Every structure is written in C-alpha cells, then in structure tokens.
Amino acid sequence: GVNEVPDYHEDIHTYLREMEVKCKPKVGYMKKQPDITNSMRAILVDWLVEVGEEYKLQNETLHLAVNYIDRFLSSMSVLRGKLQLVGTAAMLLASKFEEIYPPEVAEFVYITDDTYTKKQVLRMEHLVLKVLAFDLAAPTINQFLTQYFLHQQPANCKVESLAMFLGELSLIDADPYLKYLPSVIAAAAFHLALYTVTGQSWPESLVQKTGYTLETLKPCLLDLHQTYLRAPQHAQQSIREKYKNSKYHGVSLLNPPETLN
Amino acid sequence: SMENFQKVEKIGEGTYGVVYKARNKLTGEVVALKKIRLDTETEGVPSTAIREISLLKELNHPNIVKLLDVIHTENKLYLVFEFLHQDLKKFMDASALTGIPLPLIKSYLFQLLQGLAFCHSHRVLHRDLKPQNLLINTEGAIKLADFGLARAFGVPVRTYTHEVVTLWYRAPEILLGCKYYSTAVDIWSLGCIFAEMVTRRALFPGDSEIDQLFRIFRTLGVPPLDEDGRSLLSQMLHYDPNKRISAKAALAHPFFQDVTKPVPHL
Ligand SMILES: O=C1Cc2ccc(Br)cc2N1
Ligand SMILES: O=C1Cc2ccc(Br)cc2N1
Ligand SMILES: O=C1Cc2ccc(Br)cc2N1
Ligand SMILES: O=C1Cc2ccc(Br)cc2N1
Ligand SMILES: O=C1Cc2ccc(Br)cc2N1
Ligand SMILES: O=C1Cc2ccc(Br)cc2N1
Numbered sequence A: 001g002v003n004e005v006p007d008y009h010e011d012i013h014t015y016l017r018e019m020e021v022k023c024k025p026k027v028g029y030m031k032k033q034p035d036i037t038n039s040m041r042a043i044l045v046d047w048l049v050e051v052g053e054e055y056k057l058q059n060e061t062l063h064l065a066v067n068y069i070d071r072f073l074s075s076m077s078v079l080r081g082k083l084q085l086v087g088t089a090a091m092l093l094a095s096k097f098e099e100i101y102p103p104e105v106a107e108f109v110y111i112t113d114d115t116y117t118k119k120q121v122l123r124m125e126h127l128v129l130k131v132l133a134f135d136l137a138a139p140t141i142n143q144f145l146t147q148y149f150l151h152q153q154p155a156n157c158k159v160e161s162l163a164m165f166l167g168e169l170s171l172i173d174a175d176p177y178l179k180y181l182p183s184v185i186a187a188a189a190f191h192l193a194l195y196t197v198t199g200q201s202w203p204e205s206l207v208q209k210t211g212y213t214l215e216t217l218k219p220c221l222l223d224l225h226q227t228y229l230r231a232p233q234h235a236q237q238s239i240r241e242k243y244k245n246s247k248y249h250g251v252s253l254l255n256p257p258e259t260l261n
Numbered sequence B: 001s002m003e004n005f006q007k008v009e010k011i012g013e014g015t016y017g018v019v020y021k022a023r024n025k026l027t028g029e030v031v032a033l034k035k036i037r038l039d040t041e042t043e044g045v046p047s048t049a050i051r052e053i054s055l056l057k058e059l060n061h062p063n064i065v066k067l068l069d070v071i072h073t074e075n076k077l078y079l080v081f082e083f084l085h086q087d088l089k090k091f092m093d094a095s096a097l098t099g100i101p102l103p104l105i106k107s108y109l110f111q112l113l114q115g116l117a118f119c120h121s122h123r124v125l126h127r128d129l130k131p132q133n134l135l136i137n138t139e140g141a142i143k144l145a146d147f148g149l150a151r152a153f154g155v156p157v158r159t160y161t162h163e164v165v166t167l168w169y170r171a172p173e174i175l176l177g178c179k180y181y182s183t184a185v186d187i188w189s190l191g192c193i194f195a196e197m198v199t200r201r202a203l204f205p206g207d208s209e210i211d212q213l214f215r216i217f218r219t220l221g222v223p224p225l226d227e228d229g230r231s232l233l234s235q236m237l238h239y240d241p242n243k244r245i246s247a248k249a250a251l252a253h254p255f256f257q258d259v260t261k262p263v264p265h266l
Helices: A009-022 A038-054 A059-073 A080-098 A105-110 A118-131 A141-151 A157-172 A182-198 A205-210 A218-230 A238-242 B047-058 B088-094 B102-121 B184-199 B209-220 B227-236 B247-252
Strands: B005-012 B018-024 B030-037 B067-072 B076-082 B134-136 B142-144
Touching: A009 A141, A009 A182, A009 B102, A038 A059, A038 A080, A038 A157, A038 A238, A059 A080, A059 A118, A059 A141, A059 A157, A080 A105, A080 A118, A080 B047, A105 A118, A118 B067, A141 A157, A141 A182, A141 A205, A157 A182, A157 A218, A157 A238, A182 A205, A182 A218, B005 B030, B047 B067, B047 B076, B088 B134, B088 B184, B102 B142, B102 B184, B102 B247, B184 B227, B184 B247, B227 B247
Parallel strands: none
Antiparallel strands: B005 B018, B018 B030, B030 B076, B067 B076, B134 B142
C-alpha cells in the first residue's frame, strides 16, 4: 500500500540512481594510500559487520558506514594505526543517521578495546562530517535490494536473505567491487540469489525499471559468483557467520551454483 | 567565523538551541542562525542536527527553507538559514478576527503541497508539520521548515521512531502505534493545517492520546469551505493511510484549478 509509496517509487528510484553516481568513492583510492591496503580495509569492514551484529544494528547502517569510509579515504591519507578510528566514527555517524536507538558513544569506544579515547572518536566524528561536507544520505546496495524485492512473486524469505548476504560480501572487497555502482551490485545479487534458490533469473519487470539486463550485469555477476564461490576460503568470515543464523534463514550454508549462462 | 554576522534579536528556541535573527555586515542579507552546542566530551554532534543538515543540503526547492551555510567551530555548530518574516501560526493568530482570504489559503496550501511532494519524491519524511514550522514572507511564499524531526526513508518503509509529530497534527496510524508509517503521515498534518487556515483554530486539539483519537473519530467516523475544498480535505484526512491522497495527486485536485499567488496582510 502506501508503505510501498506507489506515487513516488519511481521518482525515488531515479533520484537514487543519480545520487549513487555522485556519492561514489574513487576507484583505486587505495593505490594512493601509502600506509593502508585492500586487505586492511577488509579487516575493518568485517569488524563493522560483527559490531553491527553485536549491537543488533540495521544492515542499512553497515552499508552507510562503508560508504562513509570509502569516501573519506578517497580524500584523506590515513595511517594504519588510525584506520579503525575512521571506521568507528563512521559507524557512529551511520548509527546517528539511520537507527531509532543508536548505541551511545561509550559503546563505540568499548568495541575498540580502548585503543582510542572517547575524545578521539568524537573529534574523528567531526572530521568525517567535514570531509563529507555532511552528505550522509548515500544510496546503498540495500536501498536497491529493498525495492528489487517488491518485484518478486511470491516473496521468498530465503532469496531475500541470500541477496542481502551477497550484497554484504561485496562490502569486504575494494577490489573489485569499488568499480561497480550500488544499483548494479544490487541487481547481480538479486539474480544470483533467485537462481541459487528458485532457478528463476533476473525478472523482466526489473529490466524495465533499471535498464539493466543479464547483458549489462555480466561483469559484476561474474565477480560476485567468484566471491560467492570462494567465501569459505576468504580470510574474513563474519558475514558467513552472520548469515548462518535462523534470523537470515541460514542461506550462507547453501551451496553456490557451479554455473550460470 | 561569525565576525560577519550581527545579532539582531532572538526569535525562538528549543533543545535544538537558540534561534537568532542576524545581519551579514558585508552583504546586508538578513538570516536566521540556529546555534547548536556540540557535546565534545559526551555525545558529539546530535543526530537531529546530522539529519537536519544532510537532508536540507539535498532539498533545494522554492517551498523548503534554504540552508545557506554551516559554520563548524570546535565547540559550536551554526546553521545559517534564509530569514522569513514569520511562521503561519503567528499569521493565523494575527488573523483570528479578520480571517485569511480564501485565495491565500489556496496559494499557501498549493505551495505546501509542492514543497512536500518534493520531500516525498526524494525519500524524505518531514514528520513535524505544523503551523509553527511553516514560514511565510511578505511576497506570498510559504515554506516547509524545521527539518529536525525529518527522516530519509527507504522503499518499502521500515519501522521508524514512534515519537514523531506534535500531538494535534499526528496521524491515526501513529496514535495507534501501527508497525509501519509512511508519506501519508505528512499529508494528514497538511490536512489539519488546511482546516486550520480556514477556521484559524486547530482541528483536533486533543489533551492526550485518547482525547486526540476520540476527536478524530467523532469528526470522521469547516463552514466557509467550497465543495472542492471539502472534497480535498476529506481525502487528505482519510482514515486509511493507503487511501489517503498523495501530495502529487493533491496538486492536480480541482480545488487548485484557479490558484493565484496573493501577498498577505502583514
Ligand atoms: O586487530 C584485529 C584482530 C581481530 C580479531 C577479530 C576481528 Br572480527 C577483527 C580483528 N582485527
Ligand atoms: O584490537 C583490535 C581488534 C580490531 C578489530 C578491527 C580493527 Br580495524 C582493529 C582491531 N584491533
Ligand atoms: O553500496 C556499495 C557500493 C560499493 C562499491 C564498492 C564496494 Br567494496 C562496496 C560497495 N557497496
Ligand atoms: O562534490 C560533490 C559531491 C556531492 C554529493 C552530494 C552533494 Br548534495 C553535493 C556534492 N558535491
Ligand atoms: O563547512 C561546511 C560544511 C557544510 C555543510 C553544509 C553546508 Br549548507 C555548508 C557547509 N560548509
Ligand atoms: O528550520 C528552521 C528553524 C527556523 C526558525 C525561523 C526561521 Br526565519 C528559519 C528557520 N529554519
């Protein structure tokens, strides 16, 4: 009904499509960071997942923080010793933005195991706001998925879970997923999830909304399929652990399909 | 930072902070400053401010108050806003005996709807529409203001903060604590406000949550309004959120087929 905002769903889709282009980090910002690497970022994002899980935060929150981190590191050289401070402030900001009941600052200090003081977190919060110029309303993969899931028939709660799962896996890996827009990553995940569970593939209804075909979405699906394939081997395992729970129906335990087209 | 601004007088307050009218010494522009104290050893930048600032940056529309600048000290946040002569509530009060001409009501309602459809078109609930948060100038414009309780929504919506909208202007889906609420809540508010510009007294002045509910019930389940006026109002005040008119739809409504833009009696 009105919950699905019929009179606005399209206007909102268009607006998100444009914003994602502008709220997009630099591809290979990481090559211009002398002190940090893709691997360190992966550790940081995986930790944010676990934080999110510990505090029962929205997935939307996690996605926002990742956007905030990548844009921030797109502008500012950060030493290794300070990477986790950027991430903590980011998750705090995202929590202030997105959650009904954000954790207090003191909890964000606690999860850093007293590596940083409350003052450092609060000062970094301000720095992050400045560097992003208070543009916090970033479109996420999650904001696309939530829309994509409306074009299901029926709704399957396994496909939803599995789509969220795949979308999150992409958060971990700057290489390759920085070069893809959230809307594109979101589609790839939707398809993969459907196929894996239903055998059905990227709906037609969603072709008309997006202008994305299995054609345009090929590179990403390839990469995603790879990532899905290799997930049990990957150094970071918080997302798999997260999706083993009954909450998400246990879809990280499913076997990937060997092949597509 | 603020050397260029001259305080003129205080114009309001809130947990938000203190609101001053002020003059740019170099340009002569008159502005409103919202001073937001930062909690630099406890909570940092309040979530209200983070939402108000970030959402107002995106929204540039003639009927949404313009955020001109943000001045980042280490201890204070100053929000520089365009100055508008006053809020609708003071205008209503000043108009209690004389009334507000129907062309003005139509114009004002037309503008409010334009403003709000832009909000909705861009994933933003306002969630605090009332006459006190709507500002008017001397030239016949009205604008949405005070985005402190606003929220960027997703599609479809999730459970959001219950404690939203001043009581009198709160939609029934919120009073009854329905798991989900959406753009419909803002339309209800504009509904109440429409009625209020006509009578110059609130439609549903409840003393409590039950009193509010009862007032809404007995009324749905304004003398000087034409047939079209009454039609639109009832569609804005539909009990069912799914059935409630949208901002976009309401802009088409026949009531507005003859809309102009009068200046008010200030
Ligand atoms: O520094 C470390 C060691 C460690 C253990 C577990 C998780 Br999750 C993240 C990290 N990062
Ligand atoms: O002690 C820890 C645990 C941990 C998690 C994540 C990051 Br980034 C750094 C660290 N250091
Ligand atoms: O929303 C997005 C867009 C994006 C780009 C790159 C990586 Br890694 C993750 C994500 N998630
Ligand atoms: O440089 C940029 C990127 C960007 C994103 C959003 C908004 Br609003 C403004 C701007 N300007
Ligand atoms: O320093 C800043 C950051 C910022 C955010 C929003 C607006 Br409007 C103005 C400014 N200037
Ligand atoms: O949103 C706000 C609060 C406020 C009060 C008064 C005037 Br003039 C402008 C503004 N801006």
